[PDB]
Amino acid sequence: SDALHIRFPDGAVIEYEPETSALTVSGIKTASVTASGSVTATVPVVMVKASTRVTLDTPEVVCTNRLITGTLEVQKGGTMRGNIEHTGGELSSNGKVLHTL
Amino acid sequence: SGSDALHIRFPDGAVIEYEPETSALTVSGIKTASVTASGSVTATVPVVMVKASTRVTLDTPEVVCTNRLITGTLEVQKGGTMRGNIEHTGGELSSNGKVLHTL
Amino acid sequence: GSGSDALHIRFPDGAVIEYEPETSALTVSGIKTASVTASGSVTATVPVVMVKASTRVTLDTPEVVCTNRLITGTLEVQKGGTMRGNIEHTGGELSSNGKVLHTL
């Protein structure tokens, strides 16, 4: 009643290891969680290793501080407030480079 | 492999189940879920799909996208930096009340 | 009842994994790490998702897609990109290669 180690016929496992306080779900194909209110995770580090794609299908994604990306595609429009510093290439608008490199 | 089974049917109508033939884990019929951890939470899977009819909030010092980020619209509140070539088309890029391609 | 109709596990490290049907709340607490490894996909369908990560959220993926609006405090684009439609900048200076493009 105080332990968790489930081993399914397809090789999937759900286990909790109290020595390292580690919860593991492995060997599954899909997971789906459907809730009517909220899903919350509170932890210093979140790591999502997704070899195809992460889709956030929502009216609004909010990042409360910094957002860092390799490349950016804004599809429809946007607003920017504050100081914005572009360097290391050329910023073009409507086919016109705004400050040649 | 093992022979364990998971199919919990709770009195509020929620279900937690694993189906090994299709290797599908399902959690249904709940109101809330939370995970609170002192170290890390990791998900390793090709596709992550979040369908959130109100909002997704990432309340963190830093969200890092290692490659491409695509959005419908963007709002930057407190500034930033852009490196590389940035190609703007299909509308007006305005700064401080002037359209920049016609300045 | 006597069947599989409940979930409440308290582990010797103080962690809890439980489902509380009175409030329909699934809770994992008191752990150090969690991981989920799947070969196909993970889906979460719920009105509100909240991730409170006091160090970082890393999305290590070819593509992150936000289907509608994305709001951020600050933005850092490292390699380049594209923008379509109207992009309205105010409340500071937009500089390119060391030149302020329009002073208010």
Of A59, A65, A92, which is closest to B55 when you measure between CB atoms? Answer: A59
Contact between chains at C19 and B16 (C-beta distance less than 8 A): yes
User: Which neighbouring-strand residues pair with B94?
Assistant: B99, C88
Which residues, including other chains, have CB under 8 Å from residue C2's CB and lie 6 or more apart? Answer: none
Contact between chains at B47 and A50 (C-beta distance less than 8 A): yes
Number of domains in chain B: 1
Q: Is residue B63 part of a domain?
A: no
Question: What is the extent of the structural domain holding B18?
Answer: 1-32
Chain B residues whose CB is inside 8 A of the C48 CB are 52, 54-55, 57
Reading the block at residue B55, the tokens are 């909002």
Chain A residues whose CB is inside 8 A of the C57 CB are 46, 48
Resolution for the entry shown, Å: 0.9
B22, exposed or middle or buried, with CB in 10 Å at 0-12, 13-18, 19+?
exposed
Of A51, A58, A67, which is closest to C68 when you measure between CB atoms? Answer: A58
Chain B residues whose CB is inside 8 A of the C3 CB are 9
The number of helix segments (H) and strand segments (E) in chain B equals 0, 10
Instruction: Give residue C44's Cα distance to chain centre.
Output: 12
CB A34 within 8 A of CB C45: yes
Q: Is residue A37 part of a domain?
A: no
Q: Is residue A2 part of a domain?
A: yes
Chain C residues whose CB is inside 8 A of the B82 CB are 75-77, 80-81
Say how many C-beta atoms besides its own lie within 10 A of residue C64's C-beta. Answer: 27
**Rounded-to-integer distance, Cα C92 and Cα C75, Å:** 14
User: Which neighbouring-strand residues pair with B62?
Assistant: A66
The number of helix segments (H) and strand segments (E) in chain C equals 0, 9
Phi, psi of B5, deg, nearest 5: -140, 150
CB A65 within 8 A of CB B80: no
Q: Is residue A51 part of a domain?
A: no
Closest Cα of chain A to B11: distance in Å?
16
- Which residue reads 């884990």 in tokens? B25
Which residues, including other chains, have CB under 8 Å from residue B6's CB and lie 6 or more apart? Answer: A6, A8, A14, B16, B17, B18
Closest Cα of chain C to B22: distance in Å?
11
Q: Is residue B28 part of a domain?
A: yes
Of C27, C46, C60, which is closest to B66 when you measure between CB atoms? Answer: C60
Contact between chains at B45 and C42 (C-beta distance less than 8 A): yes
Rg over CA atoms, chain B: 22
Closest Cα of chain C to B88: distance in Å?
5
Task: Report which secondary-structure segment, H or E, holds C88.
Answer: strand C86-90
Count CA atoms within 13 Å of residue C41 on its CB side: 13
Rg over CA atoms, chain C: 23
- Which residue reads 């951890």 in tokens? B37
Residues 40-79 of A with CB under 8 A from C: 40-79
Q: Is residue B74 part of a domain?
A: no
Q: Is residue C18 part of a domain?
A: yes
CB B42 within 8 A of CB C33: yes
Reading the block at residue B41, the tokens are 């939470």
Which experimental technique did the depositors report for determining this structure?
X-ray
List the end-to-end C-alpha distance of chain C, in Å, as a whole number. Answer: 71
Q: Is residue B101 part of a domain?
A: no
Task: Tell me the residue ranges of DSSP E strands in C1-104.
Answer: 7-10, 16-20, 25-45, 48-52, 56-60, 63-84, 86-90, 94-96, 99-100
Task: Tell which residue, C76, C23, C12, has the closest CA to residue B86.
Answer: C76
Of A48, A52, A79, which is closest to C88 when you measure between CB atoms? Answer: A79
**Rounded-to-integer distance, Cα C7 and Cα C100, Å:** 61
Residue of A nearest to C82 (CA): A73
Closest Cα of chain A to C18: distance in Å?
12
Instruction: Give residue C65's Cα distance to chain centre.
Output: 12
Judged by a CB distance cut-off of 8 A, whether residue B15 touches chain A is: no
